[PDB]
Amino acid sequence: ASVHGTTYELLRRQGIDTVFGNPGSNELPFLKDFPEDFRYILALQEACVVGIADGYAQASRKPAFINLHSAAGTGNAMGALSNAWNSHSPLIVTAGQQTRAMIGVEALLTNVDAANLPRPLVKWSYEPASAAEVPHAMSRAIHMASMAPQGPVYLSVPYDDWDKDADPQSHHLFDRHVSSSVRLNDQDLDILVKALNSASNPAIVLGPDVDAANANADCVMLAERLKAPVWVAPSAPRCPFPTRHPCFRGLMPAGIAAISQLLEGHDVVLVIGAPVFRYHQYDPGQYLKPGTRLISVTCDPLEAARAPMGDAIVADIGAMASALANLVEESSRQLPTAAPEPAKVDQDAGRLHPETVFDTLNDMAPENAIYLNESTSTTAQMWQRLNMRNPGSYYFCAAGGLGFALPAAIGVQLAEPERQVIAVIGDGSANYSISALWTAAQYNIPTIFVIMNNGTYGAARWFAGVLEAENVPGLDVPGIDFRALAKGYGVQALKADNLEQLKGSLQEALSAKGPVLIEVSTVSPV
């Protein structure tokens, strides 16, 4: 059998049926005679390919396969790979390399020193020594991407490899099953459980890997058994907990001092599926105040190693959350009182306050809606004002790289056709991966895009204030007509200049069978 046939069989046999790509010559011998049980999703630029692929992988909780064109295509997608690195997204990124006969001469579209290009943003990067090796290399890619801690991997493949004979023994690869579904040994897990049982004022902190493990329900049960408040870890890329549960206390601010204060008076702090911690703003102080003991559970040794404080257990979040949920005694302490409802804000008949948008979305959106956030100055309000009961209801660019939410919303909507994806994106952020809209139109993926137009990079202006930066150029982005942009890529476009128009547009957007973009005129913070 050929490398072509063997590789598609391995993919198929390992559960892959969708290829996200932007093609070029070095990929044609891979893509030719594309099998009828595979689906190809074209995006017009490689940051969109990877973003779409990334949303699809996070929502489906399974590896996503990507096909890019050499160094240029791989390069265009590296910002997107930084997000995928931080979210532990199992992406199998493959890139076509020149024919082996011309790699030496460095013909046009040779990916020189290819394995080094995506580093340090990939778990594994490789160009096979021979055509026969390609299926084995792909096998490695697949398992490396899928093993905890999940993440992007990179395989460069010379285009002449596909027509060559596969390694005869390649069939051993098809049904290889690898498991990293592990948990702390019995003796040490009992010690942890006793520690949690003996705590007088436990707090829980939950990171994105809880939602990637679909460990949300076990964390609810753990929280209810320990009668403990629950915060989402800072810079949250996913929502690991129902936002209106009695225990839920919201998003931790991304600051050292803010978090030690929040955790003060809690004797044990159990962190699950999060870095300790993903701070953003510099807010020096104590990592922890006296009296506080931190225990981290993470699937990534890199996170465990770099924690400035606390103990760590490196294990599968799914397996550990389940184990802990079912092992901890029910505490006779009083269950936390639900956080109060956010106060409605004053809203005139003109431009919309972000708080008004999220209240309207919350009232009109279905209870199984999935929200994507790239409205970077409105994030704290969005967390207060959206009720998200279900797992897989929230995504935010995990490495802070803009151009994620728009394409990612298209991948999430593809992965979850029965759940309405609502992407809330700033006018700044929308431009990074704008051409992703075209995939929504061509493949008729019914994502709703709500562009929050305040005419500026609002969050940049906020940081300018916190860093006392005066006379900073390039913080405003006037003169962008997002309805024309939507129209350019064949997406239905609505305006929402006020609350009356917003409600009308959401009603029309929610019923639509294709993608809809709503341009909301929001109040600038200037």
Next chain:
Amino acid sequence: ASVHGTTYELLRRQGIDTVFGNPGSNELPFLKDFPEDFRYILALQEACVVGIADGYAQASRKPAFINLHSAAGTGNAMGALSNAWNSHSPLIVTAGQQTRAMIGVEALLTNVDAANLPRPLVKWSYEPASAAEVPHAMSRAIHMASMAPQGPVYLSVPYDDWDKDADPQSHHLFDRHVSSSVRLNDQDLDILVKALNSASNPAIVLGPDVDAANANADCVMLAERLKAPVWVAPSAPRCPFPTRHPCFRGLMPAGIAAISQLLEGHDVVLVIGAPVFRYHQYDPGQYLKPGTRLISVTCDPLEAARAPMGDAIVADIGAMASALANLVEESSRQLPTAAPEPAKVDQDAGRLHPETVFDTLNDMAPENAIYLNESTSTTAQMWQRLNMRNPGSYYFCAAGGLGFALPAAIGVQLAEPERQVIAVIGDGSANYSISALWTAAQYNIPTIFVIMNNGTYGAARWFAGVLEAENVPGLDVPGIDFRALAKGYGVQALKADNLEQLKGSLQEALSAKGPVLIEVSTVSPV
């Protein structure tokens, strides 16, 4: 002084007065108190930032300075860096890093292992070990960018460095002159001149570094005294020769066998400022046919090392072209006859043959027009049909990475305000860096954007033919309205459904004071 003040003084004294960027928190302490004698050019995405800076750097023949945001911003720009790598574009790429105190905990927007990210696409890549080192590091960046072979470099700077005290001894950095304007020693140069004087049927092949060195006029002299036909080396990123000069023989096809067949009968082939060679399609055969001696003059050791044939001289192209032009005797042989005018392609009253568009541009565009090419299926015709008399008149993505021409056209126009820049871009290629249109609108940069809309990735279909690949998905890009895209970014948009509308639209765009986009309906190759 502060590291901030010392660094801007270094830039200023090194002739840098313009920052191309897309800002973020990590860049604010660098961009704050932006000096009044500096200019800041915002682009909405980093591939556009770098593309505009690259076009600018190539047209000005001076380094361009770039400021990006962490791993995300740098990542977004890497496809653009691979083009800059192949074009020897002197790009100084700076990226903001997290405060040194939070680099270890890997807070959000820590560029982890930063220096490795842009590798292998930069000459030099560095993160200073202290704030006081930053001006020295920047000095190194500037000189590494600017020394032959020119190319992109990378500096990651923790944002807390900028406010720190500068070393008073950093003042030595300000007026450093580094020269790489070198040529072959007298003895060996005379030997080369005698070989060229003794040649009975010499050929000259010119690459992009001739144009980058502005050695075009010297190569014209060299060609006229040797009475030698001149080709442009394959996959040409620039035009190093007047295309209607009697000696000019056209763009070499990007294939091994094709080139050796072309150079057959020429006893000495002098290659200047090009790789040997930038083949593209695999067209195996002889590198050189018997009887052809090849001598390459290159400013890049890496090119000289990887030539599969010939002698090489590593030296500055300008110093060497000038030396050779002046040292060679005038041959008594007859001057080559000018290539015949290309035949007029039959055109009906409907969709436009590409050949018709280039004929119209040639008849209507000014004689000092600058063209950029990202209409990938029409390159050979463009080269046959555009008369480019002057230096700096043609640009094409040097590593074949699409998303170059649109932003680069804006950079070129910025650097050359008195030369009309016309970017001929395919409908597929337009989408990679579409948001660069915004920068042309905001800064009123009067580039003409000619979108050749054939409904498809035509050059991919051509390679599918040559690779005998059938049932390849993702080769069609229907349903894109470019006039609506232009409108969304504030650029004036015209259509051209036929020859008369093309003429009218070009007349209107040529006289326009702002940027204009023309969507041309072109005949599809399918």
Next chain:
Amino acid sequence: ASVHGTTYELLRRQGIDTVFGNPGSNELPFLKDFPEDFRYILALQEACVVGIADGYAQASRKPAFINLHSAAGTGNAMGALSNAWNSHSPLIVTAGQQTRAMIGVEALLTNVDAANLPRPLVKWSYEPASAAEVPHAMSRAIHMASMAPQGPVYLSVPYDDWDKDADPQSHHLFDRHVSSSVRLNDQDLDILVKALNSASNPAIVLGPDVDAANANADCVMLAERLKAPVWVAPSAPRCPFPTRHPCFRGLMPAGIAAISQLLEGHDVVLVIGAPVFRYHQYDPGQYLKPGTRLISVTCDPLEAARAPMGDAIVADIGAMASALANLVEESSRQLPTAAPEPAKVDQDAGRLHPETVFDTLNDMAPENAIYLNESTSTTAQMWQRLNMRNPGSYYFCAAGGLGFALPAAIGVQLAEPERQVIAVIGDGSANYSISALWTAAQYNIPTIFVIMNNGTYGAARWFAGVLEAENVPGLDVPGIDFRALAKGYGVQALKADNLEQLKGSLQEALSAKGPVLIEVSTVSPV
């Protein structure tokens, strides 16, 4: 032809006839049917293999070819490659790789991610994508190592490649000549010559690349015409000037303040073939005091870029030194007066002072002797007391990597059969590459090893004083019998406990036909 046959032809055709190696399974298909016109030099460990080739390459001023065993062998030589990096030694390091069929499974002696292993200490690092590419890859390594700035390169080759069919078009590789023999253009060179002619108190500073270029003779004539004093740049790996020429002022100390104090009063300082500067100890102050113009001529862009001060010309040192010596006017200033002869130190009938050893060596050694220094606390006294009239008379570990001198002494002696090599090596430093003694013995290479036994790491204790480091362990090395070690490896062993025995031992060493080690009891600094 085979890859094997074609590769040996290329090597042969490019002037290589000697292979320095330590063999293993992965290299046997390369080493088999070893040509009759090639020589193989075995060393017992890879630091010694590379040390010997380095000495050979430096003495011969030609590339040396090395063959090491996969990752462990390559890894063993990486300390030695750091020296080779710093001395710009043209080393072609090949390492055998596992058969391509077993790379993926990572069989024992798979060099995983091979090209990254020797980085960042190599100019070029590569594993070919196919067997047929190996000759081309070898061509690249050969030229990359040989081109200015010369340096070590690395090629990893799967062992199954050698028996495979080579491409017939690889014959074009055989006689490729690449020149980097370049100098500054006429116009800018005239400006420099005019500046040198106009200097009232010029100084010259010379570094190792002068010796490497064999530009010593031209620098003597340059110094004599400019009537200028001449220093060797600090931490000198080589000797670029006769040490008793009237202009010679000695080895600059490796500190910032000490060098600006030395250069004070010189209006123009011409630095040729050196970094600016290779400091060592931290001696903060001014890089250059006001009133001095520093002009650096360097073959290395990396050196040009990182100089804290001065202008730079990146050119070939031989071409430049020759150019300048012929272009400068003869100054009417008086020739500098020779520095005084050093004072005879007090010496009793017991342990030898280093000064006595070098005085005795100067008296007794032949005038064409070659000295290698790895006696680290006595370098200053060595430069004062040895008259080195000739080029190629001194070598010292260029990156400060101990274990260079002993093996490099053997390579130099092999390269220079008619010049007596005398390696002066401390008792600590002798141990790093002690096994190299065997190679001297086995190939009957008559190096003299003078071992300076002071029973301690002297220069470490010195630095311990300048750093005020008390209670530091591991500074003493008692209980090593170097005659026993010499006997162990079959090298004739003498001793010198006093001046009488030293004079007798050296007389014997100089007259001996094979290698000789002399263990000298020297006064300890403790």
